[PDB]
Amino acid sequence: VSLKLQKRLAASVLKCGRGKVWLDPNEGNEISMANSRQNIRKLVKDGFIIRKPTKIHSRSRARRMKEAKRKGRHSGYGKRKGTREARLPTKVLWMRRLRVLRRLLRKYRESKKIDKHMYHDMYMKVKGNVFKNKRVLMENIHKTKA
Amino acid sequence: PKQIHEIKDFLLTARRKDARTVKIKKNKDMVKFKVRCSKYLYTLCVSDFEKADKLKQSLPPGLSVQDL
Amino acid sequence: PSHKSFMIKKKLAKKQRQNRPIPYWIRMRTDNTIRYNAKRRHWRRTKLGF
Amino acid sequence: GASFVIDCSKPVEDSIMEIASLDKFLQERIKVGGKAGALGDSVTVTRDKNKITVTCNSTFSKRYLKYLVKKYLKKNNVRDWLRVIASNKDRNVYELRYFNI
RNA sequence: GAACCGGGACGUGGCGGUUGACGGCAACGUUAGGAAGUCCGGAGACGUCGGCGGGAGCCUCGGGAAGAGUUAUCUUUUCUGUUUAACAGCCUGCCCACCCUGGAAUCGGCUCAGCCGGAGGUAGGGUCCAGCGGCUGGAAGAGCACCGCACGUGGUGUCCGGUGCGCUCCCGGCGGCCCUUGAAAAUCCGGAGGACCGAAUGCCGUCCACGCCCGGUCGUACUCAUAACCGCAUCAGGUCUCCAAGGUGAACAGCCUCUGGUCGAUGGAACAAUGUAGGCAAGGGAAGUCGGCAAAAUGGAUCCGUAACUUCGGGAAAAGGAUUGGCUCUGAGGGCUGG
RNA sequence: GUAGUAGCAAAUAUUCAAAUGAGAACUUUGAAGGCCGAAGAGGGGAAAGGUUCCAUGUGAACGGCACUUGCACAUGGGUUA
Ligand SMILES: [K+]
Ligand SMILES: [K+]
Ligand SMILES: [K+]
Ligand SMILES: [K+]
Ligand SMILES: [K+]
Ligand SMILES: [K+]
Ligand SMILES: [K+]
Ligand SMILES: [Mg+2]
Ligand SMILES: [Mg+2]
Ligand SMILES: [Mg+2]
Ligand SMILES: [Mg+2]
Ligand SMILES: [Mg+2]
Ligand SMILES: [Mg+2]
Ligand SMILES: [Mg+2]
Ligand SMILES: [Mg+2]
Ligand SMILES: [Mg+2]
Ligand SMILES: [Mg+2]
Ligand SMILES: [Mg+2]
Ligand SMILES: [Mg+2]
Ligand SMILES: [Mg+2]
Ligand SMILES: [Mg+2]
Ligand SMILES: [Mg+2]
Ligand SMILES: [Mg+2]
Ligand SMILES: [Mg+2]
Ligand SMILES: [Mg+2]
Ligand SMILES: [Mg+2]
Ligand SMILES: [Mg+2]
Ligand SMILES: [Mg+2]
Ligand SMILES: [Mg+2]
Ligand SMILES: [Mg+2]
Ligand SMILES: [Mg+2]
Ligand SMILES: [Mg+2]
Ligand SMILES: [Mg+2]
Ligand SMILES: [Mg+2]
Ligand SMILES: [Mg+2]
Ligand SMILES: [Mg+2]
Ligand SMILES: [Mg+2]
Ligand SMILES: [Mg+2]
Ligand SMILES: [Mg+2]
Ligand SMILES: [Mg+2]
Ligand SMILES: [Mg+2]
Ligand SMILES: [Mg+2]
Ligand SMILES: [Mg+2]
């Protein structure tokens, strides 16, 4: 007894693929009598036609490995395939630094810790690659003001 | 669909000759009065349940009132 | 294709009507020599040319 | 604060389980502060004739209680007959029911 | 069920008459708020590359609740989901542009990069523009999940956050490139002009709101291909394009997986020669052969180092050398609030 | 004649149980083991085809083995602005 029609209709009614349709192997005769979507829908309620669960694909391993990477594991030279630029462009690092340093200079000017004359001087030195991070810029400002 | 903000305005549109029906939708935090007109479905939201009952019995006779 | 002219669709309809077996009672007529439909067409074997 | 209930009526009446045993399982296996069995003042387990009650002084996951109850059923080879189901009446209660085979 | 568009017709209300509205210093705002021939502008309407910024969908992390999987041991764990359309109103106001005040060297502002300012910067306060942004209506009554009762019907939930040189698409703005400068028209909007026109207050005008009526003809199944097209065929060939998950990794490389699809290539038994495809091999190392043909060797990344020659740009990954797993740690590089 | 000979060999792969049938390595269901691995063997469309779409049934022929099978054959149904 061919059940091709019932499996096709069950897939459409269940809104799933034909591979996820389960037709009760012990009720082939009962299922074979359903030739309409109304009949299929009734069989779904009765439990003779069931949508099987999705095949398992867990992310536990991926999440577990990300924890190890967050601690610095698997990050040695033997685990690197792209160039340092490919892994993280130098332009990206430069953009981060300027936005951090320019943000820091604006807030100091707004709070009047530095005047516009000192802001301009520090602004051009930041663009000139003088200060490599937030800490050194703060120390230079304190030293210059003293 | 348009929203009516004033109960007075809702009553005026409920008396229109093209108002086919009114439906009462009672949610868990307010009551919605929906009146079907020719072009738009106007909806009025009344948070106070007690204040909604007064409007319910103030609708013009002959207008099909339904409870949802 | 799905996009087709009215004229072409009409021609295709006539070809479908002509693609049938001869009635059985034709072969029982007096002095009959028509054995079968000699102009049968299958969509995959011979193309319509239009 | 949180208080959850495990309504064990259908199996207790049919002598399918021992409500006292489930109380012991929850007390030993419940983890407070990351360590099992350290209920302390935070977590208290009180049983009745046909109902188990779990109260917590801080945030307590309801699904965590289901995880432990299901584990207890598996250890007693009764999962194929029993199943933990939430109650439509109360949102802090789990009920033990049978499969409609 | 809820909207919209193009036509047709009149009615009610509203609006204007200082005959053709009002507000704002201004940029402009408001729902209406004359007008003919003629005239003018705009939209439609446009290359390519690169960097940034914004929006949407997806991916991804945590918590809450629902079901499922695992459970001798371990696992507050693993998996599935956890929804919100056009359209209408209100709010928001990106990146730019624009307006008012004010008048700048001790020059300042400012981008990743530019760049901007007495032709008016910074600053202070505004206007406008985008939206695939927010809220509400639409709309939970739907959808989905789950639990019941019957064999249609009821109940519960659909919640609260984080993250980014991520991916796809859209948009913004800027820059590079040309002896290359990268369509047209239909259609629509706006403007200049003011011939002509009402009322002494009832007529006239009205792109406003609401109500009423109308909607031709043809195409629409299916395949779109290792079987629906062409190649004489159910031919390993040929045939334009859209959507595009997780892991590894620089990577729509290769390798493995989820959704979806599929096991369709006539089968069975033996394991000779010869063959085709894939390999390996002591010692020697091109002696083989027309010829290193074929194969082998090299290969990613980090650090060091790099000659002749040169059109000074290259040569260059020249050459040569070192390092690379796992595990447990240390240091450095940020954001938002609080005077 | 050649001759029941050349030949059926790319695209990893099938196995178990049951049902149906005169007849099952090849149809259908279930279970397992594999593959495509999102520039797909997935989901659509433009050309081109023209009913191949769907249901039921089937003597032969055809689907280069076989078939209970079907893009084959027979009957009917199906494309709404
Ligand atoms: K639309
Ligand atoms: K169609
Ligand atoms: K082909
Ligand atoms: K051999
Ligand atoms: K040689
Ligand atoms: K096509
Ligand atoms: K049309
Ligand atoms: Mg990169
Ligand atoms: Mg650079
Ligand atoms: Mg052909
Ligand atoms: Mg011809
Ligand atoms: Mg133009
Ligand atoms: Mg270039
Ligand atoms: Mg972006
Ligand atoms: Mg300003
Ligand atoms: Mg809403
Ligand atoms: Mg609902
Ligand atoms: Mg693209
Ligand atoms: Mg004018
Ligand atoms: Mg179609
Ligand atoms: Mg198909
Ligand atoms: Mg296709
Ligand atoms: Mg030909
Ligand atoms: Mg990576
Ligand atoms: Mg890849
Ligand atoms: Mg050797
Ligand atoms: Mg050797
Ligand atoms: Mg040697
Ligand atoms: Mg030699
Ligand atoms: Mg020789
Ligand atoms: Mg060679
Ligand atoms: Mg050289
Ligand atoms: Mg032979
Ligand atoms: Mg061969
Ligand atoms: Mg063989
Ligand atoms: Mg093969
Ligand atoms: Mg096979
Ligand atoms: Mg492969
Ligand atoms: Mg694979
Ligand atoms: Mg692509
Ligand atoms: Mg055959
Ligand atoms: Mg078919
Ligand atoms: Mg046929």
Swiss-Prot record, chain B:
GO molecular function: structural constituent of ribosome
Signal peptide bounds: none
Protein name as it appears in the record: Large ribosomal subunit protein eL38
Keywords of this entry: Ribonucleoprotein, Ribosomal protein
Superkingdom of the source species: Eukaryota
InterPro entries in the cross-refs: Ribosomal_eL38, Ribosomal_eL38_sf
Family: Belongs to the eukaryotic ribosomal protein eL38 family.
Presence of the UniProt keyword Metal-binding in the record: no
Cellular component terms (Gene Ontology): cytosolic large ribosomal subunit
Pfam families, sorted: Ribosomal_L38e (PF01781)
GO biological process, one term: translation
Gene3D superfamilies reported in the protein's UniProt record: 3.30.720.90
